PDB file of all heavy atoms in Angstrom:
ATOM      1  N   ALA A  11      37.987 -49.984  20.642  1.00 46.29           N
ATOM      2  CA  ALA A  11      38.432 -49.793  22.018  1.00 46.29           C
ATOM      3  C   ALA A  11      39.638 -48.858  22.087  1.00 46.29           C
ATOM      4  O   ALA A  11      40.411 -48.722  21.134  1.00 46.29           O
ATOM      5  CB  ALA A  11      38.771 -51.142  22.665  1.00 46.29           C
ATOM      6  N   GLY A  12      39.808 -48.215  23.236  1.00 46.98           N
ATOM      7  CA  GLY A  12      40.985 -47.383  23.428  1.00 46.98           C
ATOM      8  C   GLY A  12      42.274 -48.177  23.264  1.00 46.98           C
ATOM      9  O   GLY A  12      42.383 -49.326  23.703  1.00 46.98           O
ATOM     10  N   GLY A  13      43.255 -47.564  22.607  1.00 44.22           N
ATOM     11  CA  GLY A  13      44.560 -48.167  22.442  1.00 44.22           C
ATOM     12  C   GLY A  13      44.731 -49.076  21.235  1.00 44.22           C
ATOM     13  O   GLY A  13      45.822 -49.643  21.059  1.00 44.22           O
ATOM     14  N   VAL A  14      43.700 -49.232  20.391  1.00 43.95           N
ATOM     15  CA  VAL A  14      43.814 -50.155  19.265  1.00 43.95           C
ATOM     16  C   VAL A  14      44.559 -49.528  18.094  1.00 43.95           C
ATOM     17  O   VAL A  14      45.015 -50.256  17.201  1.00 43.95           O
ATOM     18  CB  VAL A  14      42.446 -50.676  18.784  1.00 43.95           C
ATOM     19  CG1 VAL A  14      41.726 -51.460  19.883  1.00 43.95           C
ATOM     20  CG2 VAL A  14      41.560 -49.552  18.295  1.00 43.95           C
ATOM     21  N   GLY A  15      44.713 -48.203  18.087  1.00 46.99           N
ATOM     22  CA  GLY A  15      45.347 -47.480  17.014  1.00 46.99           C
ATOM     23  C   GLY A  15      44.413 -46.655  16.124  1.00 46.99           C
ATOM     24  O   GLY A  15      44.792 -46.359  14.978  1.00 46.99           O
ATOM     25  N   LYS A  16      43.215 -46.289  16.598  1.00 44.59           N
ATOM     26  CA  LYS A  16      42.332 -45.461  15.779  1.00 44.59           C
ATOM     27  C   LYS A  16      43.018 -44.165  15.377  1.00 44.59           C
ATOM     28  O   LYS A  16      43.001 -43.776  14.201  1.00 44.59           O
ATOM     29  CB  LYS A  16      41.035 -45.162  16.532  1.00 44.59           C
ATOM     30  CG  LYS A  16      40.247 -46.397  16.947  1.00 44.59           C
ATOM     31  CD  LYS A  16      38.957 -45.971  17.668  1.00 44.59           C
ATOM     32  CE  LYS A  16      39.257 -45.172  18.946  1.00 44.59           C
ATOM     33  NZ  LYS A  16      40.032 -45.998  19.924  1.00 44.59           N
ATOM     34  N   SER A  17      43.636 -43.483  16.344  1.00 43.43           N
ATOM     35  CA  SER A  17      44.273 -42.205  16.036  1.00 43.43           C
ATOM     36  C   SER A  17      45.497 -42.394  15.137  1.00 43.43           C
ATOM     37  O   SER A  17      45.710 -41.613  14.199  1.00 43.43           O
ATOM     38  CB  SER A  17      44.644 -41.478  17.335  1.00 43.43           C
ATOM     39  OG  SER A  17      43.469 -41.081  18.035  1.00 43.43           O
ATOM     40  N   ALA A  18      46.281 -43.450  15.371  1.00 44.16           N
ATOM     41  CA  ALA A  18      47.471 -43.668  14.554  1.00 44.16           C
ATOM     42  C   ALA A  18      47.088 -43.973  13.112  1.00 44.16           C
ATOM     43  O   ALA A  18      47.745 -43.502  12.174  1.00 44.16           O
ATOM     44  CB  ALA A  18      48.336 -44.804  15.127  1.00 44.16           C
ATOM     45  N   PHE A  28      54.110 -42.102  11.522  1.00 50.00           N
ATOM     46  CA  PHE A  28      53.709 -42.788  12.743  1.00 50.00           C
ATOM     47  C   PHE A  28      54.583 -42.266  13.872  1.00 50.00           C
ATOM     48  O   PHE A  28      55.805 -42.228  13.737  1.00 50.00           O
ATOM     49  CB  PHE A  28      53.858 -44.319  12.596  1.00 50.00           C
ATOM     50  CG  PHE A  28      53.631 -45.088  13.878  1.00 50.00           C
ATOM     51  CD1 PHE A  28      52.339 -45.373  14.310  1.00 50.00           C
ATOM     52  CD2 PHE A  28      54.706 -45.560  14.625  1.00 50.00           C
ATOM     53  CE1 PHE A  28      52.113 -46.087  15.485  1.00 50.00           C
ATOM     54  CE2 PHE A  28      54.494 -46.279  15.802  1.00 50.00           C
ATOM     55  CZ  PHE A  28      53.197 -46.535  16.236  1.00 50.00           C
ATOM     56  N   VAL A  29      53.959 -41.874  14.982  1.00 48.83           N
ATOM     57  CA  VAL A  29      54.665 -41.359  16.154  1.00 48.83           C
ATOM     58  C   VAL A  29      54.183 -42.140  17.372  1.00 48.83           C
ATOM     59  O   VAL A  29      53.018 -42.022  17.778  1.00 48.83           O
ATOM     60  CB  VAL A  29      54.435 -39.856  16.350  1.00 48.83           C
ATOM     61  CG1 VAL A  29      55.185 -39.383  17.584  1.00 48.83           C
ATOM     62  CG2 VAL A  29      54.888 -39.092  15.112  1.00 48.83           C
ATOM     63  N   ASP A  30      55.077 -42.933  17.959  1.00 48.39           N
ATOM     64  CA  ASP A  30      54.719 -43.751  19.110  1.00 48.39           C
ATOM     65  C   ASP A  30      54.086 -42.900  20.198  1.00 48.39           C
ATOM     66  O   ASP A  30      54.596 -41.830  20.546  1.00 48.39           O
ATOM     67  CB  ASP A  30      55.953 -44.473  19.656  1.00 48.39           C
ATOM     68  CG  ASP A  30      56.273 -45.733  18.876  1.00 48.39           C
ATOM     69  OD1 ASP A  30      55.565 -46.746  19.087  1.00 48.39           O
ATOM     70  OD2 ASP A  30      57.212 -45.707  18.042  1.00 48.39           O
ATOM     71  N   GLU A  31      52.951 -43.370  20.714  1.00 50.28           N
ATOM     72  CA  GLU A  31      52.267 -42.806  21.873  1.00 50.28           C
ATOM     73  C   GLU A  31      51.711 -41.411  21.634  1.00 50.28           C
ATOM     74  O   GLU A  31      51.303 -40.743  22.593  1.00 50.28           O
ATOM     75  CB  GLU A  31      53.186 -42.798  23.102  1.00 50.28           C
ATOM     76  CG  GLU A  31      53.274 -44.144  23.783  1.00 50.28           C
ATOM     77  CD  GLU A  31      51.966 -44.536  24.443  1.00 50.28           C
ATOM     78  OE1 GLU A  31      51.545 -43.844  25.398  1.00 50.28           O
ATOM     79  OE2 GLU A  31      51.343 -45.531  24.006  1.00 50.28           O
ATOM     80  N   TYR A  32      51.644 -40.949  20.386  1.00 54.18           N
ATOM     81  CA  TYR A  32      51.055 -39.645  20.123  1.00 54.18           C
ATOM     82  C   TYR A  32      49.583 -39.653  20.509  1.00 54.18           C
ATOM     83  O   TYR A  32      48.860 -40.609  20.208  1.00 54.18           O
ATOM     84  CB  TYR A  32      51.212 -39.270  18.650  1.00 54.18           C
ATOM     85  CG  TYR A  32      50.654 -37.899  18.327  1.00 54.18           C
ATOM     86  CD1 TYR A  32      51.415 -36.756  18.518  1.00 54.18           C
ATOM     87  CD2 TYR A  32      49.358 -37.751  17.840  1.00 54.18           C
ATOM     88  CE1 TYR A  32      50.911 -35.501  18.222  1.00 54.18           C
ATOM     89  CE2 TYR A  32      48.841 -36.498  17.545  1.00 54.18           C
ATOM     90  CZ  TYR A  32      49.629 -35.375  17.734  1.00 54.18           C
ATOM     91  OH  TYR A  32      49.129 -34.122  17.447  1.00 54.18           O
ATOM     92  N   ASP A  33      49.143 -38.586  21.175  1.00 53.61           N
ATOM     93  CA  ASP A  33      47.764 -38.453  21.659  1.00 53.61           C
ATOM     94  C   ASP A  33      47.151 -37.184  21.091  1.00 53.61           C
ATOM     95  O   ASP A  33      47.452 -36.080  21.577  1.00 53.61           O
ATOM     96  CB  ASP A  33      47.720 -38.392  23.188  1.00 53.61           C
ATOM     97  CG  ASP A  33      48.035 -39.713  23.838  1.00 53.61           C
ATOM     98  OD1 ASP A  33      47.268 -40.663  23.634  1.00 53.61           O
ATOM     99  OD2 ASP A  33      49.046 -39.793  24.575  1.00 53.61           O
ATOM    100  N   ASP A  57      37.725 -39.198  14.279  1.00 53.23           N
ATOM    101  CA  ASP A  57      38.509 -40.088  15.133  1.00 53.23           C
ATOM    102  C   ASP A  57      37.906 -40.052  16.533  1.00 53.23           C
ATOM    103  O   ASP A  57      38.108 -39.093  17.283  1.00 53.23           O
ATOM    104  CB  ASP A  57      39.963 -39.643  15.125  1.00 53.23           C
ATOM    105  CG  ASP A  57      40.814 -40.431  16.065  1.00 53.23           C
ATOM    106  OD1 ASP A  57      40.514 -41.619  16.316  1.00 53.23           O
ATOM    107  OD2 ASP A  57      41.801 -39.852  16.543  1.00 53.23           O
ATOM    108  N   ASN A 116      44.246 -54.027  13.395  1.00 38.42           N
ATOM    109  CA  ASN A 116      45.431 -53.172  13.382  1.00 38.42           C
ATOM    110  C   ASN A 116      46.578 -53.781  14.197  1.00 38.42           C
ATOM    111  O   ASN A 116      46.416 -54.776  14.919  1.00 38.42           O
ATOM    112  CB  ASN A 116      45.072 -51.772  13.916  1.00 38.42           C
ATOM    113  CG  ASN A 116      46.195 -50.744  13.705  1.00 38.42           C
ATOM    114  OD1 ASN A 116      46.780 -50.639  12.620  1.00 38.42           O
ATOM    115  ND2 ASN A 116      46.502 -49.996  14.748  1.00 38.42           N
ATOM    116  N   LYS A 117      47.754 -53.149  14.083  1.00 40.71           N
ATOM    117  CA  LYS A 117      49.000 -53.594  14.730  1.00 40.71           C
ATOM    118  C   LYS A 117      49.447 -54.951  14.191  1.00 40.71           C
ATOM    119  O   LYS A 117      49.979 -55.787  14.927  1.00 40.71           O
ATOM    120  CB  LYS A 117      48.875 -53.629  16.260  1.00 40.71           C
ATOM    121  CG  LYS A 117      48.243 -52.365  16.873  1.00 40.71           C
ATOM    122  CD  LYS A 117      48.603 -52.238  18.370  1.00 40.71           C
ATOM    123  CE  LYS A 117      47.817 -51.147  19.062  1.00 40.71           C
ATOM    124  NZ  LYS A 117      48.202 -51.033  20.517  1.00 40.71           N
ATOM    125  N   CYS A 118      49.266 -55.169  12.882  1.00 42.09           N
ATOM    126  CA  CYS A 118      49.654 -56.440  12.280  1.00 42.09           C
ATOM    127  C   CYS A 118      51.166 -56.575  12.112  1.00 42.09           C
ATOM    128  O   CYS A 118      51.634 -57.645  11.698  1.00 42.09           O
ATOM    129  CB  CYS A 118      48.925 -56.642  10.935  1.00 42.09           C
ATOM    130  SG  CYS A 118      49.456 -55.636   9.511  1.00 42.09           S
ATOM    131  N   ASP A 119      51.932 -55.520  12.431  1.00 39.06           N
ATOM    132  CA  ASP A 119      53.386 -55.611  12.500  1.00 39.06           C
ATOM    133  C   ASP A 119      53.864 -56.387  13.719  1.00 39.06           C
ATOM    134  O   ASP A 119      55.043 -56.751  13.773  1.00 39.06           O
ATOM    135  CB  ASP A 119      53.998 -54.213  12.566  1.00 39.06           C
ATOM    136  CG  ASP A 119      53.452 -53.395  13.731  1.00 39.06           C
ATOM    137  OD1 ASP A 119      52.284 -52.936  13.621  1.00 39.06           O
ATOM    138  OD2 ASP A 119      54.173 -53.228  14.755  1.00 39.06           O
ATOM    139  N   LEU A 120      52.996 -56.620  14.701  1.00 37.38           N
ATOM    140  CA  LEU A 120      53.389 -57.236  15.965  1.00 37.38           C
ATOM    141  C   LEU A 120      53.310 -58.753  15.840  1.00 37.38           C
ATOM    142  O   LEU A 120      52.257 -59.295  15.489  1.00 37.38           O
ATOM    143  CB  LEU A 120      52.495 -56.747  17.112  1.00 37.38           C
ATOM    144  CG  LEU A 120      52.728 -55.293  17.544  1.00 37.38           C
ATOM    145  CD1 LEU A 120      51.924 -54.942  18.792  1.00 37.38           C
ATOM    146  CD2 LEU A 120      54.213 -54.987  17.768  1.00 37.38           C
ATOM    147  N   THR A 144      45.889 -54.092   9.183  1.00 15.82           N
ATOM    148  CA  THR A 144      46.632 -52.852   9.014  1.00 15.82           C
ATOM    149  C   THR A 144      47.775 -52.766  10.016  1.00 15.82           C
ATOM    150  O   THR A 144      47.757 -53.395  11.081  1.00 15.82           O
ATOM    151  CB  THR A 144      45.741 -51.618   9.215  1.00 15.82           C
ATOM    152  OG1 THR A 144      45.256 -51.623  10.559  1.00 15.82           O
ATOM    153  CG2 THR A 144      44.558 -51.624   8.231  1.00 15.82           C
ATOM    154  N   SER A 145      48.760 -51.935   9.670  1.00 16.07           N
ATOM    155  CA  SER A 145      49.731 -51.422  10.626  1.00 16.07           C
ATOM    156  C   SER A 145      49.901 -49.929  10.389  1.00 16.07           C
ATOM    157  O   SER A 145      50.463 -49.519   9.371  1.00 16.07           O
ATOM    158  CB  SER A 145      51.072 -52.137  10.504  1.00 16.07           C
ATOM    159  OG  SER A 145      52.000 -51.520  11.373  1.00 16.07           O
ATOM    160  N   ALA A 146      49.428 -49.108  11.336  1.00 16.47           N
ATOM    161  CA  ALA A 146      49.760 -47.688  11.275  1.00 16.47           C
ATOM    162  C   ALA A 146      51.259 -47.469  11.395  1.00 16.47           C
ATOM    163  O   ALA A 146      51.758 -46.442  10.921  1.00 16.47           O
ATOM    164  CB  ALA A 146      49.036 -46.914  12.386  1.00 16.47           C
ATOM    165  N   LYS A 147      51.984 -48.416  11.998  1.00 15.17           N
ATOM    166  CA  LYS A 147      53.423 -48.241  12.176  1.00 15.17           C
ATOM    167  C   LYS A 147      54.186 -48.429  10.867  1.00 15.17           C
ATOM    168  O   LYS A 147      55.085 -47.641  10.549  1.00 15.17           O
ATOM    169  CB  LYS A 147      53.933 -49.202  13.252  1.00 15.17           C
ATOM    170  CG  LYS A 147      55.423 -49.083  13.532  1.00 15.17           C
ATOM    171  CD  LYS A 147      55.780 -49.854  14.805  1.00 15.17           C
ATOM    172  CE  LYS A 147      57.297 -49.936  14.962  1.00 15.17           C
ATOM    173  NZ  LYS A 147      57.667 -50.477  16.312  1.00 15.17           N
TER     174      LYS A 147
HETATM  175  N1  GDP K 201      53.176 -51.576  16.869  1.00 18.49           N
HETATM  176  C1  GDP K 201      52.106 -50.800  16.572  1.00 18.49           C
HETATM  177  N2  GDP K 201      51.713 -49.867  17.464  1.00 18.49           N
HETATM  178  C2  GDP K 201      50.665 -49.067  17.189  1.00 18.49           C
HETATM  179  C3  GDP K 201      49.934 -49.222  15.927  1.00 18.49           C
HETATM  180  N3  GDP K 201      48.941 -48.319  15.928  1.00 18.49           N
HETATM  181  C4  GDP K 201      49.018 -47.633  17.104  1.00 18.49           C
HETATM  182  N4  GDP K 201      50.056 -48.085  17.838  1.00 18.49           N
HETATM  183  C5  GDP K 201      50.460 -47.609  19.167  1.00 18.49           C
HETATM  184  O1  GDP K 201      49.444 -48.067  20.052  1.00 18.49           O
HETATM  185  C6  GDP K 201      49.161 -47.061  21.034  1.00 18.49           C
HETATM  186  C7  GDP K 201      47.687 -46.668  20.963  1.00 18.49           C
HETATM  187  O2  GDP K 201      47.431 -46.058  19.692  1.00 18.49           O
HETATM  188  P1  GDP K 201      46.314 -44.921  19.498  1.00 18.49           P
HETATM  189  O3  GDP K 201      46.419 -44.395  18.101  1.00 18.49           O
HETATM  190  O4  GDP K 201      46.435 -43.809  20.534  1.00 18.49           O
HETATM  191  O5  GDP K 201      44.981 -45.803  19.691  1.00 18.49           O
HETATM  192  P2  GDP K 201      43.503 -45.208  19.931  1.00 18.49           P
HETATM  193  O6  GDP K 201      43.267 -45.070  21.435  1.00 18.49           O
HETATM  194  O7  GDP K 201      42.580 -46.247  19.340  1.00 18.49           O
HETATM  195  O8  GDP K 201      43.363 -43.885  19.234  1.00 18.49           O
HETATM  196  C8  GDP K 201      50.052 -45.879  20.692  1.00 18.49           C
HETATM  197  O9  GDP K 201      51.252 -45.987  21.450  1.00 18.49           O
HETATM  198  C9  GDP K 201      50.430 -46.090  19.250  1.00 18.49           C
HETATM  199  O10 GDP K 201      51.694 -45.502  18.925  1.00 18.49           O
HETATM  200  C10 GDP K 201      50.415 -50.262  15.000  1.00 18.49           C
HETATM  201  O11 GDP K 201      49.846 -50.471  13.897  1.00 18.49           O
HETATM  202  N5  GDP K 201      51.476 -50.988  15.394  1.00 18.49           N
END
Side-chain angles (χ1 to χ4, degrees):
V14 298
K16 301 181 299 298
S17 293
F28 173 81
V29 180
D30 278 284
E31 280 292 295
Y32 182 85
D33 289 296
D57 175 30
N116 190 47
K117 313 200 190 181
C118 73
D119 56 285
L120 288 187
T144 63
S145 175
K147 181 168 171 170

